């Protein structure tokens, strides 16, 4: 008669929650239509065949039996509805049979889905890069085109059109997918398809001026330079406005009147999140959240507007709306001991108060750039209000989904139904840095305190980092073997 936790989703949030939740203390069931976890950062490597599926996945059932002897459960179902008042969910199986399941706690970790921005033709003609199947269909399509263009029944003009790969999105995924194809094209493809090599082209399309815009400006410049040197067409300051079967249209970001029509053989849509239908439907059943576009949780990751406080959400499907500083001005004033309401006084209690208000974190509020002398209570109120307003929810990353999962599973293991049940601290994420592979052995990294901008050892750095991020020795084994395989025998052409 253990308390029942249902986890929705087998992704970065759901799977890492499963990995850490105590199966002895709780009865845990994970529910997802996907019976494996996907190591998403390595998906671009799958498009070119640099790494294989064994590196990029984990089967959920392999992690249901922990060392202590207590077990979790897994069900291959898609959740369609949540009924928070009666504490059950409705699911369907692959045959649309309905399943009803009761819970004591619900962890919503259903992620997000691809977003076409309703641009005509994108869903019909473009390839997304969101999961294992996506990457493999992309790889297979490219391989198919190479074989098709080796046939005698096609002209050089038609080849140039068919062998043009266009990647839409200048963020890390678009960049890495482009880099991986450029390497593949320049190495194995050049060797095995020498007669059509010269007709192959790649373009990357990005609305802003910078590839990798969330990295540093020096990294962006170096990335565009590396792409130029690789003869990739860098179409920064352009965005897609229409997609047809054999061509698409782009629009200048600098001149609204300038458009271009481009022929293509493979169109890859590397960008865009939208909310799952489950989340859209769930929102409308919570009065307080009825017209939200995204699920809001509080600073403890509890879904807002649930009287029972027994539904949580983590990862890409949620945004945090923390307890407001300015609704607790007087309490905070008393807490301040340096009696003189200054920003420095507040910062002096920031260790204690961040346990309640994550927006006070030095990672969330720049105290040095927002210093304030002595304030009246009303002015202090207004200041707290600015800190509230400034709070940024965790970015939609694997990094944050993983940290939230560990935080929350630890809360269930060591705080809930124990004498620390009222000492639960708020969630505050830690940025660990970002990495990107940008072609021809060059890796860039934007880390706390370091930037990496290519060089002979940058690819070594990437391997050292990722082998430690993999979640099993099996995957690490494959990670190592795949690089040996690729070095000695090259990328595979089997499709």
Ligand X SMILES: Cc1c(-c2ccc(Cc3ccc(OC(F)(F)F)cc3)cc2)[nH]c2cccc(F)c2c1=O
Ligand Y SMILES: COCCOCCOCCOc1ccc(C(C)(C)CC(C)(C)C)cc1
Q: Would you count residue 437 as binding ligand X (CB under 6 A)?
A: yes
Long-range CB contacts (< 8 A, 24+ apart) of 416-421? Answer: 417/3
Q: Binding mask 412-451 vs ligand Y (x if CB under 6 A, - otherwise)?
A: --------------------xxxx----------------
Q: Binding mask 300-319 vs Mg ion (x if CB under 5 A, - otherwise)?
A: ---------------xxx--
For residue 280, the minimal CB distance to ligand X (Å) is 23
The string over 405-443, giving b where at least 16 C-beta atoms fall within 10 Å of a residue's C-beta and e elsewhere, is: bebbbebbeebeeeeeeeebebbbbeeeebbbbbbbbbb
Q: Would you count residue 56 as binding ligand FAD (CB under 6 A)?
A: no
Partner that binds at residue 464, options Mg ion, ligand FAD, ligand Y, none, CB closer than 5 to 8 Å by kind: ligand Y
The correct pick among 422, 449, 450, 488 for binding ligand Y (CB under 6 A) is: 488
Cα 296 from Cα 303, distance rounded (Å): 6
Cα 31 from Cα 394, distance rounded (Å): 24
Cα 253 from Cα 425, distance rounded (Å): 44
Cα 175 from Cα 270, distance rounded (Å): 9
Q: Which of 421, 446, 423, 442 is nearest to 433 (CA)?
A: 446
Q: Would you count residue 187 as binding ligand Y (CB under 6 A)?
A: no
For residue 349, the minimal CB distance to ligand X (Å) is 45
At a CB cut-off of 8 Å and minimum separation 6, what does 18 contact? 7, 28, 30, 60, 63, 64, 72
Span from 48-56, 113-121, 246-254, 385-393 in contact with ligand X (CB under 6 A): 48-56
Q: Would you count residue 440 as binding ligand X (CB under 6 A)?
A: yes
Residue 86 annotated as part of some ligand binding site:
no
Residues that contact ligand FAD, how many (by CB under 6 A): 32
Residue 306 in tokens: 């649930």
Span from 83-91, 132-140, 321-329, 416-424 in contact with ligand X (CB under 6 A): 132-140
Residue 221 annotated as part of some ligand binding site:
no
Cα 201 from Cα 265, distance rounded (Å): 10
- Ranked by CB distance to ligand FAD, the top (closest) residue is 11
Partner that binds at residue 467, options Mg ion, ligand FAD, ligand Y, none, CB closer than 5 to 8 Å by kind: ligand Y
Span from 149-157, 391-399, 410-418, 485-493 in contact with ligand FAD (CB under 6 A): 391-399
Residue 10 annotated as part of some ligand binding site:
yes
Residue 389 in tokens: 């307003």
Residue 151 in tokens: 């046939």
Partner that binds at residue 473, options Mg ion, ligand Y, ligand X, none, CB closer than 5 to 8 Å by kind: ligand Y
Residue 119 in tokens: 């641009």
Q: Which residues bind its own copies (CB under 8 A)?
A: 35-36, 53-54, 57, 59, 61-62, 64, 74-77, 93-94, 97, 99, 144, 147-148, 150-153, 192-193, 473-474, 477-478, 481, 485, 488-489, 492-495
Provide the edge-to-edge strand list for the sheet that holds 127-128.
127-128, 266-269, 164-168, 201-206, 233-236
- Of 10 and 237, which has the nearer Cβ to ligand X? 10
Residue 240 annotated as part of some ligand binding site:
yes
Q: Would you count residue 40 as binding ligand FAD (CB under 6 A)?
A: yes
Radius of gyration (C-alpha) of the chain in whole angstroms: 25
Residue 460 annotated as part of some ligand binding site:
no
Locate all alpha helices (DSSP H) within 256-392, ordered by sequence.
277-283, 329-335, 343-348, 350-353, 377-390
Q: Are 82 and 66 in contact (CB under 8 A)?
A: no
Q: Would you count residue 61 as binding ligand X (CB under 6 A)?
A: no
Q: Would you count residue 322 as binding Mg ion (CB under 5 A)?
A: no
14 to 33, contacts with ligand FAD by CB under 6 A? 14, 31-33
How far apart, in Å, are the Cα atoms of 462 and each of 57, 135, 437, 457?
19, 21, 8, 9
Locate all alpha helices (DSSP H) within 149-212, ordered by sequence.
156-162, 172-184, 190-192
For residue 467, the minimal CB distance to ligand Y (Å) is 5
Residue 466 annotated as part of some ligand binding site:
yes
Q: Which of 404, 296, 274, 401 is nearest to 11 (CA)?
A: 401
Residue 195 annotated as part of some ligand binding site:
no
Residue 253 in tokens: 């970001």
Residue 196 in tokens: 């059509």
Q: Binding mask 220-259 vs ligand X (x if CB under 6 A, - otherwise)?
A: ----------------------------------------
For residue 125, the minimal CB distance to ligand X (Å) is 20
Positions touching ligand X (CB under 6 A) are: 34, 45-46, 49-50, 52-54, 132-133, 136, 139, 183, 186-187, 437, 440-441, 459, 462-463, 492, 494-495
Binding-site residue ranges for FAD:
10, 12-13, 40, 79, 316, 396, 398-399, 466
Residues at the contact surface with ligand Y, assessed by CB under 6 A: 41, 398-399, 402, 432-435, 464-465, 467-469, 471-473, 476-477, 480, 488
């Amino acid at each position: 008669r253990k308390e029942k936790i249902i986890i929705l989703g087998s992704g970065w949030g759901g799977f890492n929650f499963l990995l850490n939740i105590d199966f002895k203390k709780y009865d845990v069931t994970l529910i997802s239509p996907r019976n494996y976890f996907t190591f998403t950062p390595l998906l671009p490597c799958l498009c070119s065949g640099t790494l294989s599926v064994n590196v990029c996945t984990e089967s959920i059932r392999n992690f249901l039996r922990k060392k202590n002897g207590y077990c979790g459960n897994y069900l291959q179902l898609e959740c369609t509805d949540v009924f928070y008042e009666d504490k059950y969910i409705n699911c369907i199986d692959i045959e649309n049979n309905k399943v009803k399941l009761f819970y004591d706690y619900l962890i919503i970790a259903v992620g997000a889905k691809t977003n076409t921005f309703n641009i005509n033709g994108v869903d019909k003609y473009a390839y997304f890069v969101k999961d294992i199947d996506d990457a493999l269909k992309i790889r297979k399509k490219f391989l198919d085109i190479l074989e098709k263009c080796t046939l005698p029944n096609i002209s050089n003009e038609e080849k140039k059109k068919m062998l043009h790969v266009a990647v839409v999105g200048g963020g890390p995924t678009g960049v890495e997918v482009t880099a991986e194809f450029a390497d593949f094209i320049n190495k194995e493809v050049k060797i095995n398809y020498k007669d059509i090599f010269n007709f192959i082209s790649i373009s990357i399309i990005e609305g802003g001026n910078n590839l990798l815009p969330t990295f540093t400006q020096n990294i962006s410049d170096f990335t565009k330079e590396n792409f130029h040197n690789l003869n990739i067409n860098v179409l920064t300051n352009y965005y897609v406005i229409d997609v047809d079967k054999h061509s698409f249209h782009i629009q200048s970001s600098l001149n609204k009147n300038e458009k271009k029509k481009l022929s293509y053989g493979l169109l890859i849509w590397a960008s865009g999140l939208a909310q799952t239908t489950l989340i859209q439907k769930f929102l409308k059943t919570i009065p307080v959240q009825a017209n939200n576009a995204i699920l809001k949780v509080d600073e403890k990751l509890r879904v807002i507007g649930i009287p029972s406080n027994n539904i949580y959400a983590i990862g890409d499907c949620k945004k945090i709306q923390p307890k407001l500083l300015h609704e607790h001005t007087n309490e905070i004033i008393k807490i301040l001991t340096g009696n003189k309401l200054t920003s420095e006084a507040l910062k002096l209690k920031q260790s204690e108060l961040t346990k309640t208000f994550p927006q006070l974190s030095i990672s969330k509020w720049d105290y040095e750039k927002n210093k304030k002398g002595e304030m009246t209570p009303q002015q202090f109120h207004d200041y707290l209000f600015e800190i509230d307003k400034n709070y940024k929810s965790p970015t939609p990353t694997a990094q944050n989904a993983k940290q939230e999962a560990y935080y929350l599973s630890n809360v269930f293991n060591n705080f809930i139904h124990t004498n620390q049940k009222f000492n639960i601290p708020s969630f505050i994420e830690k940025w660990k840095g970002s990495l990107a592979y940008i072609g021809n052995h060059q890796v860039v990294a934007d880390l706390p305190y370091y930037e990496l901008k290519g060089g002979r050892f940058s690819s070594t750095f990437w391997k050292v980092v990722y082998i430690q991020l993999l979640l099993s020795w099996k995957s690490r084994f494959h990670f190592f073997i795949d690089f040996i395989k690729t070095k000695w025998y090259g990328r595979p052409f089997i499709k």
